[PDB]
């Protein structure tokens, strides 16, 4: 063993303070686990046809598989990570329908790129408003928040590939959307242009969200290219989070979930992975040392280069790791020394 005074002291018995292996499965207990299968969190939020089983569900940890794929209308979400983290921290997909007026337009649009049964469909939580008898009047719709809790609204804008398509769907070539509340406003203008085809569709959809406080009112003023919401999600606070892992779900008990299965949380340090959920030991770089409950955290792996923000995140996590490794080393040394001293 290692001590402050002597780097190599032989002792009769010793124990390992670093966990280096994993079970290989997620224990499914005591935390509530929701397996996403082929669905991502955003796809389950929007109402992808293959994710219809995730409606109104709740979770403590959301598991995203690398096999996940989208099978609906192509879309992109500005500030995707922020919305994903918000929904993951909320910890519920509970949905409540609201009766918006939407007078003078057609409702419940469907696309051939989104197949639910044998026919065309669309996102279950989104409403595609189009022309009615080749007319599209301006919409002035309101919805007040008379409840005691916050409301979350998900809406979208549609970007056609050509001007012909614009006219063919909205009967006019100039659309604009303004969604406002007493303390916020968001103005979005569609960008008509050609884009690479996904499932034969060159068009795209951009997703935006709005939060309404109790006593506030939501106002939507649009002239076209609007993907309306059908209701609101209840947004709360809790110990929920999201994790990317390909490990199978088992049937056991463990208060610490790692991407590589569940790990025992008896030892004070571990080196399996820096991504942890629940009551977990501290992560250190040391592979062997011889003698905390965080829930939602920051993202620690990135598949794309982004620059400043990602560099700062990496720097933060590196600093944490290095300081805790120093702490571990010093602690082990001190304890070994004091034990040697007290046994002589």
């Amino acid at each position, epitope marked *: 063993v290692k001590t402050i005074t002597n780097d190599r002291i032989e002792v009769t018995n010793a124990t390992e303070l670093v966990q280096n292996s994993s079970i290989g499965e997620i224990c499914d207990s005591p935390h509530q686990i929701l397996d996403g299968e082929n669905c991502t969190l955003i796809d389950a939020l929007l109402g992808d046809p293959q994710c219809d089983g995730f409606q109104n569900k709740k979770w403590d940890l959301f598991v995203e598989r690398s096999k996940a794929y989208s099978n609906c209308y192509p879309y992109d979400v500005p500030d995707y990570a922020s919305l994903r983290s918000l929904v993951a921290s909320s910890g519920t997909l509970e949905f409540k329908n609201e009766s918006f007026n939407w007078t003078g337009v057609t409702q419940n*649009g*469907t*696309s*051939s*790129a989104c197949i639910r049964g044998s026919s*065309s469909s669309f996102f279950s939580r989104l409403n595609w408003l189009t022309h009615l*008898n*080749y007319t599209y009047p301006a919409l002035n719709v309101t919805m007040p928040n008379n409840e005691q809790f916050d409301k979350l609204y998900i809406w979208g804008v549609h970007h*056609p*590939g*050509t*001007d*012909k*398509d614009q*006219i*063919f*769907l909205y*009967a*006019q*070539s100039s659309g604009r959307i303004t969604v406002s509340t007493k303390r916020s406003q968001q103005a979005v203008i569609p960008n008509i242009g050609s884009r690479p085809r996904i499932r*034969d*569709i*060159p*068009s795209r959809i951009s997703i935006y969200w709005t939060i309404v406080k109790p006593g506030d009112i939501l106002l939507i003023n649009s002239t076209g290219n609007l993907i309306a919401p059908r209701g609101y999600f209840k947004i709360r606070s809790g110990k929920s989070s999201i994790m990317r892992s390909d490990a199978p779900i088992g049937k056991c008990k463990s208060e610490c979930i790692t991407p590589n299965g569940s790990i025992p949380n008896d030892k004070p340090f571990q080196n399996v992975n820096r991504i942890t959920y629940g009551a977990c030991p501290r992560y250190v770089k040391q592979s062997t040392l011889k003698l905390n409950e965080k829930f939602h955290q920051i993202e620690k792996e990135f598949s794309e280069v982004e620059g400043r923000i990602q560099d700062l995140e990496k720097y933060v996590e590196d600093t944490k790791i290095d300081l805790w490794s120093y702490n571990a080393e010093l602690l082990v040394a001190l304890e070994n020394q004091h034990t040697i001293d007290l046994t002589d």
Partner: antibody, heavy 115, light 109 residues
Framework: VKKPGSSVKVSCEAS?????????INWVRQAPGQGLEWMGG????????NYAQRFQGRITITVDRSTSLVHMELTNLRSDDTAVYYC?????????????????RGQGTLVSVSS | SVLTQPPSVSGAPGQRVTISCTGS?????????VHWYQQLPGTAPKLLIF???NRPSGVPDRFSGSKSGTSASLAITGLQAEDEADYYC????????????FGTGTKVT
């Protein structure tokens, strides 16, 4: 010549130089020596087919996405159904009372019903 | 539902000739434009005018169109030999479930 009470199917190609993602296909009928009449239409990539009220129950419109075709079938034919059928593609233009115009592609198909 | 049109018109070549399409409060009168189609005998109908004044590429400027109130008018500045075809006017009817309405047709001579 089709026997009375039989079915007639007219196929059309939902592709071309001017065809886009959200272009539509409409069917037009013309009796010999008479005016033009409008039948059902469909957008191959959006919504469900529309139908004229005179033909309700007898007409069906199907979209074949593998061969990029659209077919219109008329069940329970009658002697007055002898006419020439045309495909039309929808055109777009900027206006305030805008409604799509019809672009006739190719020549019509002659269908005659007799016993 | 159909739009009223003169059965036929005639005149010598070289002068203006007018055709009219009269509508109701549901078509043309409900802020809807009118399209004009041309059909030479033994051929599929073609497109002549849309948007009440727009001419597609391949149509001479001799053809003009206008709309006023619940009526529309088609005009040809100079009659020629090739103007032997029939003309139809098309609008949209918002009544009931909505449909596309065509005129009764006209014959130019």
């Amino acid at each position: 010549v089709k026997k009375p009470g039989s079915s007639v199917k007219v196929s059309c190609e939902a592709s071309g130089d001017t065809f886009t993602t959200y272009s539509g296909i409409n069917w037009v009928r013309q009796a010999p020596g008479q005016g033009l009449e409008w039948m059902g239409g469909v957008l191959p990539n959006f919504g469900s087919p529309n139908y004229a009220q005179r033909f309700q129950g007898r007409i069906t419109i199907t979209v074949d996405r593998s061969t990029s075709l659209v077919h219109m079938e008329l069940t329970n034919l009658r002697s007055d159904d002898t006419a020439v059928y045309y495909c039309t593609e929808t055109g777009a233009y900027n206006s305030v009372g805008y409604f799509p115009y019809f672009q006739f592609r190719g020549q019509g198909t002659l269908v005659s019903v007799s016993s | 539902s159909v739009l009223t049109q003169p059965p036929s018109v005639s005149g010598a070549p070289g002068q203006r000739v007018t055709i009219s399409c009269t509508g109701s409060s549901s078509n043309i009168g409900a802020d809807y434009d009118v399209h004009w189609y041309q059909q030479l005998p033994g051929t599929a109908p073609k497109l002549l005018i849309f948007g009440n004044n727009n001419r597609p590429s391949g149509v001479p400027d001799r053809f003009s169109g206008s709309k006023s109130g619940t009526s529309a008018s088609l005009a040809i500045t100079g009659l020629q030999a090739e103007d032997e075809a029939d003309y139809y006017c098309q609008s949209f009817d918002k009544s009931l479930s909505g449909s596309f309405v065509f005129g009764t047709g006209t014959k130019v001579t």
